[PDB]
Amino acid sequence: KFDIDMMVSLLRQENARDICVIQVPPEMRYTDYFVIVSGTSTRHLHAMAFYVVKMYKHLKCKRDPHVKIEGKDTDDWLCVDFGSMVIHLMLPETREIYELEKLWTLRSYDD
Amino acid sequence: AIQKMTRVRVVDNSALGNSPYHRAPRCIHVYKKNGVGKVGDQILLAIKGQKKKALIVGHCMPGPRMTPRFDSNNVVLIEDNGNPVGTRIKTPIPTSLRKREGEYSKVLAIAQNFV
Amino acid sequence: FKNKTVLKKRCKDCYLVKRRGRWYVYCKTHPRHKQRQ
Amino acid sequence: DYRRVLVCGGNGGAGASCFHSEPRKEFGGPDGGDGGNGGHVILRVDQQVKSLSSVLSRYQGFSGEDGGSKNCFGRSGAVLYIRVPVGTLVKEGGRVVADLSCVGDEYIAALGGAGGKGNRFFLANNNRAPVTCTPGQPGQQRVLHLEL
Amino acid sequence: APWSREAVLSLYRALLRQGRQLRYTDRDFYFASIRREFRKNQKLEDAEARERQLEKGLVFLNGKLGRII
Amino acid sequence: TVKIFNITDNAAIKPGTPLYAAHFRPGQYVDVTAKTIGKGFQGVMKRWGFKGQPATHGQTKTHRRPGAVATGDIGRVWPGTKMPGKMGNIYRTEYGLKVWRINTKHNIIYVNGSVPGHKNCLVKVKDSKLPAYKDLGKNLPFPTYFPDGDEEELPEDLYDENVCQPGAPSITFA
Amino acid sequence: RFLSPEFIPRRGRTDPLKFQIERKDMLERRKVLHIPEFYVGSILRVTTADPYASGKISQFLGICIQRSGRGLGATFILRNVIEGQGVEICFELYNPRVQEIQVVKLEKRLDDSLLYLRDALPEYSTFDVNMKPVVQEPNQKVPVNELKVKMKPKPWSKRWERPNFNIKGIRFDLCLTEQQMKEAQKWNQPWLEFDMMREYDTSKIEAAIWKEIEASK
RNA sequence: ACCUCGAUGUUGGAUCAGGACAUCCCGAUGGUGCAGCCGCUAUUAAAGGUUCGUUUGUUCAACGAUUAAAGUCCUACGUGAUCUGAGUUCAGACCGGAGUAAUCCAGGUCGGUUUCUAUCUACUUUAAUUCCUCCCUGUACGAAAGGACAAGAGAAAUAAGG
RNA sequence: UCCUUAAAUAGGGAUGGCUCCACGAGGGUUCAGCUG
Numbered sequence A: 001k002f003d004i005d006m007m008v009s010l011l012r013q014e015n016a017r018d019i020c021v022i023q024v025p026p027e028m029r030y031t032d033y034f035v036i037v038s039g040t041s042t043r044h045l046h047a048m049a050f051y052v053v054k055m056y057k058h059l060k061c062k063r064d065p066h067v068k069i070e071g072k073d074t075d076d077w078l079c080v081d082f083g084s085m086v087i088h089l090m091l092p093e094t095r096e097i098y099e100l101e102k103l104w105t106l107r108s109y110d111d
Numbered sequence B: 001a002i003q004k005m006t007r008v009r010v011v012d013n014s015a016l017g018n019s020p021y022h023r024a025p026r027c028i029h030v031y032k033k034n035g036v037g038k039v040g041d042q043i044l045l046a047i048k049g050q051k052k053k054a055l056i057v058g059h060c061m062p063g064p065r066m067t068p069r070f071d072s073n074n075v076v077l078i079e080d081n082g083n084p085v086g087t088r089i090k091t092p093i094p095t096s097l098r099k100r101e102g103e104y105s106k107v108l109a110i111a112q113n114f115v
Numbered sequence C: 001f002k003n004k005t006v007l008k009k010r011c012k013d014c015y016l017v018k019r020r021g022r023w024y025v026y027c028k029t030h031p032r033h034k035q036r037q
Numbered sequence D: 001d002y003r004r005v006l007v008c009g010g011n012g013g014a015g016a017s018c019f020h021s022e023p024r025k026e027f028g029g030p031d032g033g034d035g036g037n038g039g040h041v042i043l044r045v046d047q048q049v050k051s052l053s054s055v056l057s058r059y060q061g062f063s064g065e066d067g068g069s070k071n072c073f074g075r076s077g078a079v080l081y082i083r084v085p086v087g088t089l090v091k092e093g094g095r096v097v098a099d100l101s102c103v104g105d106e107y108i109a110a111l112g113g114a115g116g117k118g119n120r121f122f123l124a125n126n127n128r129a130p131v132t133c134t135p136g137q138p139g140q141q142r143v144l145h146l147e148l
Numbered sequence E: 001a002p003w004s005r006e007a008v009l010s011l012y013r014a015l016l017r018q019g020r021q022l023r024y025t026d027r028d029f030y031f032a033s034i035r036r037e038f039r040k041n042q043k044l045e046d047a048e049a050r051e052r053q054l055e056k057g058l059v060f061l062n063g064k065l066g067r068i069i
Numbered sequence F: 001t002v003k004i005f006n007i008t009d010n011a012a013i014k015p016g017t018p019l020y021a022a023h024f025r026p027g028q029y030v031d032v033t034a035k036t037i038g039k040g041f042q043g044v045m046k047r048w049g050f051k052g053q054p055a056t057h058g059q060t061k062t063h064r065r066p067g068a069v070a071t072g073d074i075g076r077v078w079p080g081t082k083m084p085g086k087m088g089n090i091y092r093t094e095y096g097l098k099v100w101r102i103n104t105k106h107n108i109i110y111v112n113g114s115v116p117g118h119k120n121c122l123v124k125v126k127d128s129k130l131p132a133y134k135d136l137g138k139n140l141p142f143p144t145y146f147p148d149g150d151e152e153e154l155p156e157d158l159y160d161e162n163v164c165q166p167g168a169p170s171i172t173f174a
Numbered sequence G: 001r002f003l004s005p006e007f008i009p010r011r012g013r014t015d016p017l018k019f020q021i022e023r024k025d026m027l028e029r030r031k032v033l034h035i036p037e038f039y040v041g042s043i044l045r046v047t048t049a050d051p052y053a054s055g056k057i058s059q060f061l062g063i064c065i066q067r068s069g070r071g072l073g074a075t076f077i078l079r080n081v082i083e084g085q086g087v088e089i090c091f092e093l094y095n096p097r098v099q100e101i102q103v104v105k106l107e108k109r110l111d112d113s114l115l116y117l118r119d120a121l122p123e124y125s126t127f128d129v130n131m132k133p134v135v136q137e138p139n140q141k142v143p144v145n146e147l148k149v150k151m152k153p154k155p156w157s158k159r160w161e162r163p164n165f166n167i168k169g170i171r172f173d174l175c176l177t178e179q180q181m182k183e184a185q186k187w188n189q190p191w192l193e194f195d196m197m198r199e200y201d202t203s204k205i206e207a208a209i210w211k212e213i214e215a216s217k
Numbered sequence H: 001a002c003c004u005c006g007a008u009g010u011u012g013g014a015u016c017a018g019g020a021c022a023u024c025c026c027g028a029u030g031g032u033g034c035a036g037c038c039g040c041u042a043u044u045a046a047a048g049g050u051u052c053g054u055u056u057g058u059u060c061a062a063c064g065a066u067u068a069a070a071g072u073c074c075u076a077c078g079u080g081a082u083c084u085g086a087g088u089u090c091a092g093a094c095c096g097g098a099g100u101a102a103u104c105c106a107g108g109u110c111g112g113u114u115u116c117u118a119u120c121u122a123c124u125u126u127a128a129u130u131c132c133u134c135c136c137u138g139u140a141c142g143a144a145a146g147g148a149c150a151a152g153a154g155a156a157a158u159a160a161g162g
Numbered sequence I: 001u002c003c004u005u006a007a008a009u010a011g012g013g014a015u016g017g018c019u020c021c022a023c024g025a026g027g028g029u030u031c032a033g034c035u036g
């Protein structure tokens, strides 16, 4: 299967400079897992995103529709939305300026 | 339906959206062959005498059943690459944005509420 | 091909052939020499 | 790693020298449109382009069209963009014009000549039937030394 | 200033405890994030912001609005 | 109404034989031809979607009129020029409509989308002629459906696979 | 006996067999989903499965501002304000992806259409998302809420003061002058309540529909 | 200066367009100073398509934003018995200039009536296109950068018909 | 050359010379609103 375990294994295999996972509660109508990962550079981000996407494509779930790769034109933030999990690849400055962690853990308790 | 010249509300944390100005933000162009913007369509916007792309995230015009109809034409400012200018979206964002063709993951990530 | 009212062989391998009603200069070595009347 | 190329900015179009006449106003006055400005030429950087191997010959900026009748102006020449690798030094014959390093860094290498004026441009209360037809000024033309 | 002097410290202890069993995320980054959150701000607030900060920290601890796995 | 269907000799049926909705099956594609709703003599704006002329800014007695009908050179009007006239009430065919369901009890066919003509109007229904559906007649009752055959009394409702049948547990996109 | 509006057909030349078939499907779906009795003005919480997510439900609470449509396509649009943003959703009753309809507060309003709540003050559309359901006695006429809302400045989505709308739930005296009311009376059309041929008698139709429903039971 | 001076202003715009191909886009090819992408050039192709705004009466033009593209033309510079009258054109008035004056002006400006009930001809119902995303595939190609073909699926949008 | 617009052939500003109080179906430009 293609699950968060496969996600984290692949990301650690390619050695993401930083990984974080959020368990999105069911009552929020987005997804199950919110993965946020930092990278060294835009080239690194593109490489790892392409790698994980190829792994998803080749692994399993033929009936599951294919998956976009969003943020290709931008250099500091890519994102891939899977059926039940969404990965946000970015750089340290983008991550610290968008503070997705506080947003997705403290839904209405931050600025 | 956001056309050219519609006055739109910037539902965003961005300084451009939240700063006072004598002219309300107006749609300058709808990035759609028919110049009619729905949820998920991009539009140029004249803010503070500046041209800025933005994303429609809700409008008064009724849509297909089961989808929300908002009281205002809400828009989110995005960069030319696609990164949202602001870092937070306060008002509810329709969930239908997810499956529409186009990049919306960044906006959904920034969104606080969904409807 | 290049359209010419007068056809001229350029190298040794440029050969004239009348095909589909008009003259052509074909060339295997230098396809740049292809000419059509 | 070194290249010399020739640019040629667009020459402005030439004005027109016509006169208008219509059924109830036989002497309708000067009717010559201005010529269009020549097209600028610009060098721009590309990370994709590695070197000056894919260079070419005289890059001729487009020339503005001539003025027409009915005071129709002439379309200004289109802007021609040349592309070069990142980190290209552009020189004239000794003079250094620009060190183009950043992605998309762009410099005007040859301006286009201002378009000529038609005879209606010279219309005035004093000058009621000008015939003067100023030609389009020429555009800067120069050789460029490119080195990485 | 805060709800109680020991409330914040117990909260930090509980966050670190809950990070002890952290599995999928980067443990070092998680600790760094907690340190930033509790150091860059919790020095010199006013007396009023302390209640909001500790409330949001407690909600984060609870994790019913999304927990770190 | 009597309508003529072109068939191969393989499919000839003795005159007098009844035909039933189950002659079609869900998932099949069908063509429906009928007389469109008759709108009578209609102006050019409604009949052909002409832009008409502005409401104000001086326009005198021309708001919905055809503009120029031709050029001055030909000195006539080309045949087939779009002009005001009777609209609707002509035979039109909708091609490639999916058959979503068949009520065998009442002989109802549920055809995707819209069909020409008004309610309670007779429509001629036939297997779709589109190339994509050229050879989908393998599994359909070839001559026709014969209830008298009684090979298997069909259910009251035949459903296509994707149809969310009423009475099924509420669909969850799990 | 509350016959849900969608069962009663709008008059027309459509064959009754079509309505029989549609009612059969509607009832056979109602056997799965309990569509409670509710009226325009009652607060409802609708739980629906989202296809955008993976088998995850979404809940929307709001005041039913309009009941429209007939047959299987019948809809009800209900309104609310979330973080100060007015949102309306038109829910299809028989959509297979509405998991539940809960009548949080069963009540009738002075009007059969509360579309003017768009122009009313935001307080009259605000409803707590987590409000708990109130209880009505088993044998009790549905309460009629005689609330008359206050409107915001005159530019409105519709000319609510006009007689053809027949709005009774707006405090017009507060926002409109006597001159404005008199002017709006120019569209009175008093004969329209007395033309007897315009009235649609549905007694027999309702009786037949009730027989069908009971037979389905 | 050949027809029309025995009631046809003209330019723009609107409406509706017919046509040419000397093709702007879409299609198929040859060459290339085309590795791939890209362009440049030429052959063939007229079935289809060929944007919205600010200033200006404007055709044009500049500018802004797009587009697959915003093609060059002819059609009484198509089309006012279909429309409009903004420029220009009639009677009013200024500015500037000429003139002794009357008056005048290829100039600048403010204002200024657009009739027609159709006899005849003609006519009044004659197999879509593009783009984007995805698969192929960040595969071919390429040192890299970059980045395909062909084939297929899904989304839209437009056009036509309902 | 500046302001005004995203874009501005428009608009506003850098005896004689000025000063426009009020008025105007005068001629231009504009915010906001309003609207088929």
Ligand SMILES: [Mg+2]
Pocket (backbone or CB within 6 Å): B049, B050
């Ligand atoms: Mg500005």
Ligand SMILES: [Mg+2]
Pocket (backbone or CB within 6 Å): F051, F052, F053, F054, F055
């Ligand atoms: Mg109109």
Ligand SMILES: [Mg+2]
Pocket (backbone or CB within 6 Å): F059, F060, F061, F062, F063
């Ligand atoms: Mg009129």
Ligand SMILES: [Mg+2]
Pocket (backbone or CB within 6 Å): G157
């Ligand atoms: Mg309205």
Ligand SMILES: [Mg+2]
Pocket (backbone or CB within 6 Å): none
């Ligand atoms: Mg002679």
Ligand SMILES: [Mg+2]
Pocket (backbone or CB within 6 Å): none
């Ligand atoms: Mg005569």
Ligand SMILES: [Mg+2]
Pocket (backbone or CB within 6 Å): none
């Ligand atoms: Mg040709």
Ligand SMILES: [Mg+2]
Pocket (backbone or CB within 6 Å): H077
């Ligand atoms: Mg001519």
Ligand SMILES: [Mg+2]
Pocket (backbone or CB within 6 Å): H085
């Ligand atoms: Mg005039």
Ligand SMILES: [Mg+2]
Pocket (backbone or CB within 6 Å): none
């Ligand atoms: Mg005069």
Ligand SMILES: [Mg+2]
Pocket (backbone or CB within 6 Å): none
């Ligand atoms: Mg004059």
Ligand SMILES: [Mg+2]
Pocket (backbone or CB within 6 Å): none
């Ligand atoms: Mg005038």
Ligand SMILES: [Mg+2]
Pocket (backbone or CB within 6 Å): H111
């Ligand atoms: Mg006047």
Ligand SMILES: [Mg+2]
Pocket (backbone or CB within 6 Å): none
């Ligand atoms: Mg007329």
Ligand SMILES: [Mg+2]
Pocket (backbone or CB within 6 Å): none
């Ligand atoms: Mg007539």
Ligand SMILES: [Mg+2]
Pocket (backbone or CB within 6 Å): none
């Ligand atoms: Mg204007």
